[PDB]
């Protein structure tokens, strides 16, 4: 079920609003191992539940139990040590929650593969940029007939957190993530740039990237880890763009990157080895937005999953003269851009240092895809 462009959905309320996203300060001055301990006090019980769901469903489809045995006993050794800070951060999470490290690593692997998204950057007539996104998730292990949801997708909602990463008590970047995950998929560096990651599918894909890694070719970056390293350590739109366009990746991806002034917005369509396309704002020629879902801009959607066309229609209807968090939230609340897989909606304003995220629901009748 789809619908006409929504209006009057902001500030959030009603049946598509699950609730607010809590803020946590992550202190980069702490040793990596300790950075997540305070968050785990609050969200550790929920992380234990989501890994329980994954384990139990895998052990249902593979009743020998041998896959989860490999996850728990061998997966860390197959991949080898991660570069810092990620190894120690994940070990800290595993140790405080008493979850096997291989399951934390597996959780961190989920985000290289099973997300869907709608990401939008807009530029108004004053040159002001907004960057918004829906974060969708579907691993499709468990269906709950009693409320028409996917088990793991729903369990991500209480794991969702807004994070203020600080060094010397000063914000470096802000992000929305899931407790237990140490990469980043959504965030901004105030006054500098904003970044969202959308999954991309291809036959030279993440499954092959993992195989190459296991077989000893480790020159590549994990997509959630390069995103985190850019947010944490890059200092400008152009620097971020260069890193994201050129770094070798474990999996294909779309990077949606906004800056801090007119014209600074692009979609970088990535193969593992390089950029297939960089599509940038061109306000002088009437190109005042970019919209990216999970298919290549020059190709047709997957017939049964076209969120790009409705997002673009609602944007064109809104026009460049009525761009704000409120009107962009309206778009991200319109089915199928909002769908049963939508975990959260995030809204970013780099130059005004405004960052919001909201947990979502999509009441029946709603598309599951
Ligand atoms: C659709 O159903 C999902 C599954 O729920 C089951 O099926 C439905 C149909 C009912 O029969 C229900 O009774 C079944 O259990 C449902 O998923 C549930 O979502 C909630 C809300 O996110 C989760 O709540 C979190 O619970 C953990 C503790 O969970 C344990 O204890 C509770 C209380 O006894 C049990 O109900 C659980 O089964 C577990 O045994 C908390 O740690 C966690 O707290 C943290 O997050 C909240 C924010 O939500 C903060 O306020 C806190 O401070 C903490 O930071 C949550 O309270 C629940 O775990 C989850 N269940 C499962 C099994 O995944 C889903 O939301 C439904 N979706 C829709 C659209 O209706
Ligand atoms: C962004 O860039 C920075 C700068 O390159 C990256 O920071 C480095 O990260 C690696 C991996 O985690 C660290 O390497 C470890 O260092 C351990 C020793 O750490 C102590 O001694 C260091 C001197 O050798 C010292 O620099 C370090 O202080 C740093 O960390 C403290 C704890 O967080 C913090 O309070 C300090 O202010 C300072 O930031 C420690 O006191 C060693 O045991 C390990 O084997 C490993 O080698 C580096 O220490 C980090 N360097 C700095 C200057 O922070 C960072 O990871 C990048 N971020 C991303 C996401 O990619
Ligand atoms: C947008 O970002 C750019 C790039 O970081 C900013 O320009 C830099 O500003 C710093 C000061 O923090 C200077 O040290 C650099 O020399 C500047 N670089 C360039 C290429 O000019 C710019 O100030 C930001 N603009 C806004 C409006 O925030
Ligand atoms: Cl699921
Ligand atoms: Cl919730």
Coordinates of C-alpha atoms and ligand atoms in Angstrom, one line a residue:
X1 CA 0.0 0.0 0.0
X2 CA 1.3 3.4 -1.1
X3 CA -0.2 6.9 -0.7
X4 CA -0.2 10.5 -1.8
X5 CA 2.5 12.8 -0.5
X6 CA 1.9 13.4 3.2
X7 CA 1.6 16.7 5.0
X8 CA 1.6 17.9 8.6
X9 CA 3.6 15.0 10.0
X10 CA 6.2 17.2 11.8
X11 CA 6.9 17.4 14.7
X12 CA 6.4 13.6 14.9
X13 CA 3.2 12.2 16.4
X14 CA 0.7 9.5 15.8
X15 CA 1.0 5.9 14.6
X16 CA 4.1 6.3 12.5
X17 CA 6.1 7.7 15.5
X18 CA 7.5 5.0 17.7
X19 CA 9.4 7.4 19.9
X20 CA 12.4 9.5 20.5
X21 CA 16.0 8.4 20.1
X22 CA 18.2 8.9 23.2
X23 CA 21.5 10.8 23.2
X24 CA 24.8 9.4 24.5
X25 CA 28.1 11.1 24.6
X26 CA 31.0 8.9 23.4
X27 CA 34.3 10.1 24.8
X28 CA 37.1 9.4 22.3
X29 CA 39.6 10.3 25.0
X30 CA 38.7 7.0 26.7
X31 CA 40.6 3.9 25.6
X32 CA 38.8 2.3 22.8
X33 CA 37.9 -0.7 25.0
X34 CA 36.0 1.5 27.4
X35 CA 34.2 3.8 25.0
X36 CA 30.9 1.8 24.8
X37 CA 30.7 0.6 28.4
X38 CA 28.2 3.3 29.6
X39 CA 25.9 2.6 26.6
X40 CA 26.1 -1.1 27.2
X41 CA 24.8 -0.6 30.8
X42 CA 21.5 0.7 29.3
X43 CA 21.3 -1.1 26.0
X44 CA 23.2 -4.4 26.7
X45 CA 20.0 -6.3 27.7
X46 CA 18.5 -5.4 24.3
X47 CA 21.6 -6.4 22.5
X48 CA 21.5 -9.8 24.2
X49 CA 18.0 -10.2 22.9
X50 CA 18.8 -9.3 19.3
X51 CA 21.7 -11.8 19.2
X52 CA 19.4 -14.4 20.8
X53 CA 17.0 -13.9 18.0
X54 CA 19.7 -14.2 15.3
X55 CA 21.2 -17.3 17.0
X56 CA 17.8 -19.1 17.4
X57 CA 16.6 -18.4 13.9
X58 CA 19.9 -19.5 12.3
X59 CA 19.7 -22.6 14.4
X60 CA 16.2 -23.2 13.1
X61 CA 17.1 -23.0 9.5
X62 CA 20.4 -24.8 10.1
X63 CA 19.4 -27.2 12.9
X64 CA 22.8 -28.9 13.1
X65 CA 23.9 -25.8 15.0
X66 CA 27.2 -25.7 13.1
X67 CA 26.9 -22.2 11.7
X68 CA 26.5 -20.6 15.1
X69 CA 29.2 -22.9 16.4
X70 CA 31.5 -21.4 13.7
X71 CA 30.3 -17.9 14.5
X72 CA 31.1 -18.3 18.2
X73 CA 34.3 -20.3 17.9
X74 CA 36.0 -19.5 14.6
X75 CA 34.7 -16.3 13.0
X76 CA 37.2 -14.0 14.8
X77 CA 40.1 -16.1 13.7
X78 CA 38.9 -16.4 10.1
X79 CA 38.9 -12.6 9.8
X80 CA 42.0 -11.8 11.8
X81 CA 42.4 -8.8 14.0
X82 CA 40.7 -5.6 13.0
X83 CA 42.6 -2.3 12.9
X84 CA 42.2 -0.1 15.9
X85 CA 40.0 1.2 17.3
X86 CA 37.5 -1.3 16.1
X87 CA 39.0 -4.5 17.6
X88 CA 39.2 -3.1 21.1
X89 CA 35.8 -1.4 20.9
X90 CA 34.2 -4.7 19.9
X91 CA 36.0 -6.6 22.6
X92 CA 34.8 -4.1 25.1
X93 CA 31.2 -4.6 24.0
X94 CA 31.5 -8.4 24.0
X95 CA 33.1 -8.4 27.4
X96 CA 30.5 -6.2 29.2
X97 CA 27.5 -8.0 27.6
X98 CA 29.0 -11.5 27.8
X99 CA 28.1 -12.0 24.1
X100 CA 30.7 -14.0 22.1
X101 CA 33.0 -11.7 20.1
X102 CA 32.0 -13.6 16.9
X103 CA 28.4 -12.5 17.4
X104 CA 29.4 -8.9 17.9
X105 CA 31.5 -9.2 14.8
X106 CA 28.6 -10.8 13.0
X107 CA 26.3 -7.9 14.1
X108 CA 28.9 -5.5 12.7
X109 CA 28.8 -7.5 9.5
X110 CA 25.0 -7.1 9.2
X111 CA 25.4 -3.5 8.3
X112 CA 27.6 -4.2 5.4
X113 CA 24.7 -6.2 3.8
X114 CA 21.0 -5.9 5.0
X115 CA 20.1 -2.3 5.1
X116 CA 17.9 -0.3 2.7
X117 CA 17.6 3.5 2.7
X118 CA 16.3 6.7 1.2
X119 CA 18.8 9.6 1.4
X120 CA 18.1 13.1 0.2
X121 CA 20.2 16.3 0.0
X122 CA 18.4 19.5 -0.9
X123 CA 19.7 23.0 -1.5
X124 CA 17.3 25.9 -1.1
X125 CA 17.3 29.2 -3.0
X126 CA 19.6 30.8 -0.3
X127 CA 22.1 28.0 -0.8
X128 CA 21.3 26.2 2.4
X129 CA 21.7 22.4 2.6
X130 CA 19.6 19.8 4.4
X131 CA 20.4 16.1 4.5
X132 CA 17.8 13.6 5.6
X133 CA 17.4 9.9 5.5
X134 CA 15.3 6.9 6.3
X135 CA 17.3 3.9 7.7
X136 CA 15.6 0.6 6.7
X137 CA 16.7 -2.9 7.7
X138 CA 15.7 -6.4 6.4
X139 CA 17.6 -9.6 7.1
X140 CA 14.2 -11.4 7.0
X141 CA 15.0 -14.2 9.5
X142 CA 11.8 -14.0 11.5
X143 CA 8.3 -12.9 10.7
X144 CA 5.9 -12.0 13.5
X145 CA 2.4 -12.7 12.3
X146 CA 0.9 -11.2 15.5
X147 CA 1.9 -7.7 14.5
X148 CA 3.1 -8.1 10.9
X149 CA 6.8 -7.2 11.5
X150 CA 10.2 -8.7 11.1
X151 CA 11.8 -9.7 14.4
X152 CA 15.3 -8.3 14.0
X153 CA 14.1 -5.1 12.3
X154 CA 11.8 -4.3 15.3
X155 CA 14.6 -5.2 17.8
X156 CA 16.8 -2.5 16.2
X157 CA 14.4 0.2 17.3
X158 CA 15.2 0.0 21.0
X159 CA 18.9 -0.3 20.1
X160 CA 18.9 3.0 18.1
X161 CA 20.9 5.8 19.7
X162 CA 22.1 9.3 18.8
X163 CA 25.8 9.7 19.6
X164 CA 27.8 12.8 20.3
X165 CA 31.4 11.9 19.7
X166 CA 33.7 14.2 21.7
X167 CA 37.5 14.8 21.9
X168 CA 38.6 17.1 24.8
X169 CA 34.9 17.8 25.5
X170 CA 34.2 19.1 22.0
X171 CA 32.0 17.5 19.4
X172 CA 33.9 15.9 16.6
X173 CA 30.8 14.3 14.9
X174 CA 27.3 13.3 15.7
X175 CA 25.6 10.1 14.4
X176 CA 22.7 7.7 14.7
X177 CA 23.6 4.1 15.2
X178 CA 22.8 0.9 17.0
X179 CA 24.2 -0.1 20.3
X180 CA 26.7 -2.9 19.6
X181 CA 27.7 -1.4 16.2
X182 CA 31.0 0.4 16.0
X183 CA 30.8 1.6 12.4
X184 CA 28.7 4.5 11.3
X185 CA 26.0 4.7 8.7
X186 CA 24.5 8.2 9.3
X187 CA 26.1 11.3 10.8
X188 CA 27.6 14.7 10.4
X189 CA 30.5 16.9 11.4
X190 CA 29.0 20.2 12.5
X191 CA 29.8 23.1 10.2
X192 CA 31.7 20.8 7.8
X193 CA 29.8 17.9 6.1
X194 CA 27.2 15.2 6.4
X195 CA 27.3 11.6 5.3
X196 CA 24.9 8.7 4.9
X197 CA 25.6 5.2 3.5
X198 CA 23.1 3.3 1.4
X199 CA 23.6 -0.4 0.5
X200 CA 24.4 -1.2 -3.2
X201 CA 24.0 -4.6 -4.8
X202 CA 26.2 -6.1 -7.4
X203 CA 27.6 -9.4 -8.6
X204 CA 31.1 -8.2 -7.5
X205 CA 29.6 -7.7 -4.1
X206 CA 30.1 -8.0 -0.3
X207 CA 29.9 -11.8 -0.3
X208 CA 33.0 -11.9 -2.6
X209 CA 34.7 -9.1 -0.6
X210 CA 34.5 -11.3 2.5
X211 CA 35.8 -14.3 0.7
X212 CA 38.8 -12.3 -0.5
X213 CA 39.4 -11.1 3.0
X214 CA 39.3 -14.6 4.5
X215 CA 41.7 -15.8 1.7
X216 CA 44.3 -13.2 2.7
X217 CA 43.6 -10.1 0.5
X218 CA 42.9 -7.4 3.2
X219 CA 43.6 -4.2 1.4
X220 CA 39.9 -3.1 1.6
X221 CA 37.9 -1.1 4.1
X222 CA 34.7 -2.1 5.6
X223 CA 32.0 0.3 4.5
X224 CA 30.8 1.2 8.0
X225 CA 34.4 1.6 9.2
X226 CA 35.5 3.9 6.4
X227 CA 32.3 6.0 7.1
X228 CA 33.3 6.2 10.8
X229 CA 36.9 7.1 10.0
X230 CA 35.8 9.9 7.6
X231 CA 33.3 11.3 10.2
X232 CA 35.9 11.0 12.9
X233 CA 39.0 12.3 11.1
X234 CA 38.2 14.1 7.8
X235 CA 37.8 17.8 8.1
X236 CA 36.1 19.0 4.9
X237 CA 33.6 18.0 2.2
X238 CA 36.3 17.8 -0.5
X239 CA 38.6 15.7 1.7
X240 CA 35.7 13.3 2.5
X241 CA 34.7 13.1 -1.1
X242 CA 38.1 12.2 -2.2
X243 CA 38.5 9.4 0.4
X244 CA 35.0 8.0 -0.2
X245 CA 35.5 8.0 -4.0
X246 CA 38.8 6.3 -4.1
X247 CA 39.2 3.9 -1.1
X248 CA 38.9 0.2 -1.8
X249 CA 35.8 -1.3 -0.2
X250 CA 34.8 -4.7 1.1
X251 CA 31.4 -4.2 -0.6
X252 CA 29.7 -1.8 -3.1
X253 CA 27.9 1.2 -1.6
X254 CA 26.3 4.5 -2.2
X255 CA 27.8 7.4 -0.2
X256 CA 25.6 10.5 0.0
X257 CA 27.7 13.4 1.1
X258 CA 26.7 17.0 1.8
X259 CA 28.9 19.9 2.7
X260 CA 28.5 23.3 4.2
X261 CA 27.8 25.7 1.3
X262 CA 25.9 25.9 -2.0
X263 CA 26.7 23.1 -4.4
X264 CA 28.3 20.7 -1.9
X265 CA 26.2 17.6 -2.3
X266 CA 26.8 14.4 -4.2
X267 CA 26.0 10.7 -4.5
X268 CA 29.1 8.6 -4.9
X269 CA 28.1 5.3 -6.5
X270 CA 30.8 2.7 -5.6
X271 CA 32.0 -0.5 -6.9
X272 CA 34.5 -2.2 -4.5
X273 CA 37.5 -0.9 -6.5
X274 CA 36.4 2.6 -7.6
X275 CA 33.6 5.1 -8.3
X276 CA 31.2 4.2 -11.1
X277 CA 29.6 7.7 -10.9
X278 CA 29.7 10.9 -8.9
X279 CA 26.5 12.9 -9.2
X280 CA 26.7 16.4 -7.7
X281 CA 24.3 19.2 -7.1
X282 CA 24.3 21.8 -9.8
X283 CA 22.1 24.6 -8.6
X284 CA 23.0 27.0 -11.4
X285 CA 21.5 24.5 -13.8
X286 CA 18.4 23.7 -11.7
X287 CA 19.7 20.6 -10.0
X288 CA 18.9 21.4 -6.4
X289 CA 18.5 18.0 -4.9
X290 CA 19.9 14.5 -5.0
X291 CA 17.8 11.4 -4.0
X292 CA 19.3 8.0 -3.6
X293 CA 17.7 4.7 -2.6
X294 CA 19.3 1.3 -3.3
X295 CA 19.5 1.1 -7.1
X296 CA 21.7 2.9 -9.7
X297 CA 20.3 6.3 -10.7
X298 CA 20.6 5.5 -14.5
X299 CA 18.9 2.1 -14.1
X300 CA 15.2 1.3 -13.5
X301 CA 14.1 0.4 -10.0
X302 CA 13.5 -3.1 -8.9
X303 CA 9.9 -3.1 -10.1
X304 CA 8.5 -4.1 -6.7
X305 CA 10.8 -1.7 -4.7
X306 CA 10.7 1.9 -6.1
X307 CA 11.1 4.4 -3.3
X308 CA 13.1 6.8 -5.5
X309 CA 10.2 7.9 -7.8
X310 CA 7.8 8.7 -4.9
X311 CA 10.5 10.6 -3.0
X312 CA 11.4 12.6 -6.1
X313 CA 7.7 13.3 -6.8
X314 CA 7.1 14.5 -3.3
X315 CA 10.3 16.7 -3.4
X316 CA 9.3 18.3 -6.8
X317 CA 5.8 18.9 -5.3
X318 CA 7.3 20.6 -2.2
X319 CA 9.6 22.8 -4.3
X320 CA 12.8 24.5 -3.5
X321 CA 10.8 27.3 -1.8
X322 CA 9.5 25.1 1.0
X323 CA 12.5 23.1 2.3
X324 CA 12.7 22.4 6.0
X325 CA 13.0 19.6 8.5
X326 CA 9.2 19.6 8.5
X327 CA 8.6 19.2 4.8
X328 CA 11.4 16.7 4.4
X329 CA 10.0 14.6 7.3
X330 CA 6.7 14.6 5.4
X331 CA 8.4 13.0 2.4
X332 CA 10.1 10.4 4.6
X333 CA 6.7 9.7 6.2
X334 CA 5.0 8.9 2.8
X335 CA 4.6 5.2 2.0
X336 CA 6.6 3.4 0.5
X337 CA 9.5 5.7 1.5
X338 CA 8.3 4.9 4.9
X339 CA 7.8 1.2 5.0
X340 CA 7.7 -1.8 7.4
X341 CA 11.5 -2.0 7.4
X342 CA 12.0 1.7 8.4
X343 CA 13.8 1.8 11.8
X344 CA 14.5 5.5 12.1
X345 CA 14.3 8.8 10.2
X346 CA 17.3 11.3 10.7
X347 CA 17.4 15.0 9.8
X348 CA 20.6 17.0 9.5
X349 CA 21.5 20.7 9.1
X350 CA 25.3 21.0 8.9
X351 CA 25.6 24.8 9.1
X352 CA 22.9 25.3 11.8
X353 CA 24.2 22.3 13.8
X354 CA 20.8 20.7 14.1
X355 CA 20.5 16.9 14.3
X356 CA 17.4 14.9 15.0
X357 CA 16.3 11.3 14.7
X358 CA 13.0 9.5 15.4
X359 CA 12.0 5.9 15.6
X360 CA 9.3 4.9 13.2
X361 CA 6.4 2.5 12.7
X362 CA 4.4 1.9 9.6
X363 CA 0.9 0.7 10.5
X364 CA -1.0 -1.8 8.3
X365 CA -1.6 -1.7 5.5
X366 CA 2.1 -1.1 4.7
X367 CA 4.5 -2.5 2.2
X368 CA 7.0 -4.9 3.8
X369 CA 9.6 -4.1 1.1
Ligands
LIG1 C1 5.8 -6.5 17.3 O1 6.1 -7.5 18.4 C2 7.5 -7.5 18.8 C3 7.7 -8.7 19.6 O2 6.9 -8.7 20.8 C4 6.4 -10.1 20.9 O3 5.3 -10.2 20.0 C5 4.3 -9.3 20.2 C6 3.2 -9.5 19.1 C7 3.8 -9.4 21.7 O4 3.2 -10.7 21.8 C8 4.9 -9.3 22.6 O5 4.4 -9.5 24.0 C9 6.0 -10.3 22.3 O6 7.0 -10.4 23.2 C10 7.8 -6.2 19.4 O7 9.2 -6.3 19.9 C11 9.4 -5.9 21.3 O8 9.6 -4.5 21.2 C12 9.8 -3.9 22.5 C13 9.9 -2.4 22.3 O9 11.0 -2.1 21.5 C14 11.1 -4.4 23.1 O10 11.3 -3.8 24.4 C15 12.6 -3.8 25.0 O11 12.6 -4.8 25.9 C16 13.8 -5.0 26.6 C17 13.6 -6.1 27.6 O12 12.9 -7.2 26.9 C18 12.7 -8.3 27.8 O13 11.7 -7.9 28.8 C19 10.4 -7.5 28.3 C20 9.5 -7.2 29.5 O14 9.2 -8.4 30.1 C21 9.8 -8.7 27.4 O15 8.6 -8.2 26.8 C22 10.8 -9.1 26.3 O16 10.3 -10.1 25.5 C23 12.2 -9.4 26.9 O17 12.1 -10.6 27.7 C24 14.3 -3.8 27.3 O18 15.7 -4.0 27.7 C25 14.2 -2.6 26.3 O19 14.5 -1.4 27.0 C26 15.4 -0.5 26.4 O20 14.7 0.2 25.4 C27 13.6 1.0 25.8 C28 13.0 1.6 24.5 O21 12.2 0.6 23.9 C29 14.1 2.1 26.8 O22 12.9 2.8 27.3 C30 14.8 1.4 28.0 O23 15.3 2.3 28.9 C31 15.9 0.4 27.5 O24 16.9 1.3 26.9 C32 12.9 -2.5 25.6 O25 11.9 -2.1 26.6 C33 11.0 -6.0 23.2 O26 12.2 -6.5 23.6 C34 10.6 -6.6 21.8 N1 10.5 -8.0 22.0 C35 11.2 -8.9 21.2 C36 10.9 -10.3 21.5 O27 11.9 -8.5 20.3 C37 7.7 -5.1 18.4 O28 8.0 -3.8 18.9 C38 6.3 -5.1 17.8 N2 6.2 -4.1 16.7 C39 5.1 -3.4 16.5 C40 5.2 -2.4 15.3 O29 4.1 -3.5 17.1
LIG2 C1 41.4 9.0 13.7 O1 42.8 9.3 13.7 C2 43.5 9.0 15.0 C3 44.9 9.5 14.8 O2 45.6 8.7 13.9 C4 43.4 7.5 15.3 O3 43.9 7.4 16.6 C5 44.8 6.3 16.9 O4 44.1 5.1 16.9 C6 44.9 4.0 17.1 C7 44.0 2.8 17.1 O5 43.1 2.8 18.2 C8 45.7 4.1 18.4 O6 46.6 3.0 18.4 C9 46.7 2.3 19.6 O7 47.5 2.9 20.5 C10 47.7 2.3 21.8 C11 48.5 3.2 22.7 O8 47.7 4.3 23.0 C12 48.3 5.1 24.0 O9 49.6 5.6 23.6 C13 49.6 6.3 22.4 C14 51.0 6.7 22.0 O10 51.6 5.6 21.3 C15 48.7 7.6 22.6 O11 48.7 8.3 21.3 C16 47.3 7.2 23.0 O12 46.6 8.4 23.3 C17 45.5 8.5 22.4 O13 44.4 7.7 22.8 C18 44.0 7.9 24.2 C19 42.9 6.9 24.5 O14 41.8 7.1 23.7 C20 43.5 9.4 24.3 O15 43.1 9.7 25.6 C21 44.6 10.3 23.8 O16 44.1 11.7 23.9 C22 45.0 10.0 22.4 O17 43.9 10.1 21.6 C23 47.2 6.2 24.2 O18 47.5 7.0 25.3 C24 48.3 0.9 21.6 O19 48.3 0.2 22.8 C25 47.6 0.1 20.5 O20 48.4 -1.1 20.2 C26 47.4 0.9 19.2 O21 48.7 1.1 18.7 C27 46.4 5.4 18.5 O22 46.9 5.6 19.8 C28 45.5 6.6 18.2 N1 46.3 7.8 18.2 C29 45.8 8.9 18.7 C30 46.7 10.1 18.6 O23 44.7 9.0 19.2 C31 41.9 7.1 15.3 O24 41.8 5.7 15.5 C32 41.2 7.5 14.0 N2 39.8 7.1 14.0 C33 39.2 6.2 13.2 C34 37.8 5.9 13.5 O25 39.8 5.7 12.3
LIG3 C1 33.0 24.9 5.2 O1 34.1 24.0 5.3 C2 35.3 24.6 4.8 C3 36.3 23.4 4.8 O2 36.6 23.0 6.1 C4 35.7 25.7 5.7 O3 36.9 26.3 5.2 C5 38.0 26.1 6.1 O4 37.9 26.8 7.3 C6 39.0 26.6 8.2 C7 38.7 27.2 9.5 O5 38.0 26.2 10.3 C8 40.3 27.1 7.5 O6 41.4 26.8 8.4 C9 40.5 26.6 6.1 O7 41.6 27.3 5.5 C10 39.2 26.7 5.3 N1 39.4 26.0 4.0 C11 39.1 26.5 2.8 C12 39.3 25.6 1.7 O8 38.6 27.6 2.7 C13 34.6 26.8 5.7 O9 34.9 27.8 6.7 C14 33.3 26.2 6.0 N2 32.2 27.1 5.8 C15 31.2 27.3 6.7 C16 30.2 28.3 6.3 O10 31.1 26.6 7.7
LIG4 CL1 14.1 -10.7 11.0
LIG5 CL1 11.2 1.0 20.9

